[PDB]
Design a protein around this ligand. Structure first.
Ligand SMILES: O=C(O)c1ccccc1O
Ligand SMILES: O=C(O)c1ccccc1O
Lengths: 97, 97
């Protein structure tokens, strides 16, 4: 149901649970691409790609802005996420070669 | 392209940007449902529903477990997301109710 067709918290919570599961499934598939990424790193030191992160974060802020969400909170959340995936990628690189 | 069909970082980053966009879009729609939730609350006090949050978090850990992601990271990320939405819902309630 749309937010305005929701008759109570049962409806609201079904939709929220679905959206959050979608997010979890996307973060899981995100990990697949991050591991695949390590095939195109020339060295371990290539992994963090700070210029790439610098480009990503304002992009995510813009998306926040365009979707009616506080840009600082979303951008900072994605800073945490991206740096966490980087850390995982390093660990994965080390463990698989 | 699938992670395994990606032929370089150009392909990897296209898919990651698509995934991160879907996540921002989903957080955007989630906000609509959180604000709609408020017309089913009594005062600033019924808003945080601690019994609801407590059931939510290990459900999110489980989904992370089933999607091959570190469960504390995902559980911790959602504690952060959920508590920020509660905050926004209180602000929203003050502003409109
Ligand atoms: O996960 C990412 O988005 C990322 C970005 C830059 C470098 C390494 C990474 O894992
Ligand atoms: O955003 C939520 O998931 C939430 C959960 C419990 C209480 C208030 C809320 O906004």
């Amino acid at each position: 149901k749309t937010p305005e067709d929701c008759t109570g918290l049962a409806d609201i919570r079904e939709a929220i649970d679905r959206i959050d599961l979608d997010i979890v499934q996307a973060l899981g598939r995100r990990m697949d691409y991050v591991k695949a990424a390590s095939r195109f790193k020339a060295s371990e030191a290539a992994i963090p790609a700070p210029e790439r992160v610098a480009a990503m974060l304002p992009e995510r802020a813009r998306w926040a802005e365009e979707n009616g969400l506080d840009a600082p909170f979303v951008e900072g959340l994605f800073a945490q996420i991206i740096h966490w995936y980087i850390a995982e990628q390093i660990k994965y690189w080390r463990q698989t070669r």
